[PDB]
Amino acid sequence: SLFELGKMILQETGKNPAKSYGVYGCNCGVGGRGKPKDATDRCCYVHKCCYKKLTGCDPKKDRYSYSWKDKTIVCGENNSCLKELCECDKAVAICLRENLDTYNKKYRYNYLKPFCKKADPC
């Protein structure tokens, strides 16, 4: 769910998740996808795409189990959808972490998300 997602992002990036990615670019946080503004944004673009492949569970409300092992997010082996959901979340946290080098504060609070160019299909 959103809780696990935010926690993973905090763990991987060490940044307030909502603060840094709640409204970042055209794909991070609220809203759907849009033309990515940068690598960090693409991470979220990929993440939202990952969510579409899910069936059987609610990505935003459904809680799933995962642990912190050797500073690595390890998804619990619960049901298939929750499992894939968890992996989707793990992947975006990791991706956001990997692209902190280009993270740009200027994209942090994009209140113009509705104006973003339409995203191509996943």
Final resolution, Å: 1.9
> What is the spatial distance between Cα 57 and Cα 96, in angstroms, rounded to a whole number?
24
Number of compact structural domains in the chain: 1
Cβ–Cβ < 8 Å for 36, 45: yes
Q: Residue 74 pairs with which residues in a beta bridge?
A: 67
Question: Are the C-beta atoms of 50 and 92 separated by less than 8 Å?
Answer: yes
CATH number, position 49: 1.20.90.10
Active site residues: 47, 89
Method: X-ray
Residue 53, domain extent: 1-122
Question: What is the C-alpha to C-alpha distance for residues 12 and 97, in angstroms, rounded to an integer?
Answer: 6
State the alpha helices, DSSP H only, in the chain: 2-13, 17-21, 39-52, 80-98, 105-108
- What Cα–Cα distance (Å) separates residue 115 from each residue in 7, 19, 32, 36, 102? 29, 21, 12, 12, 22
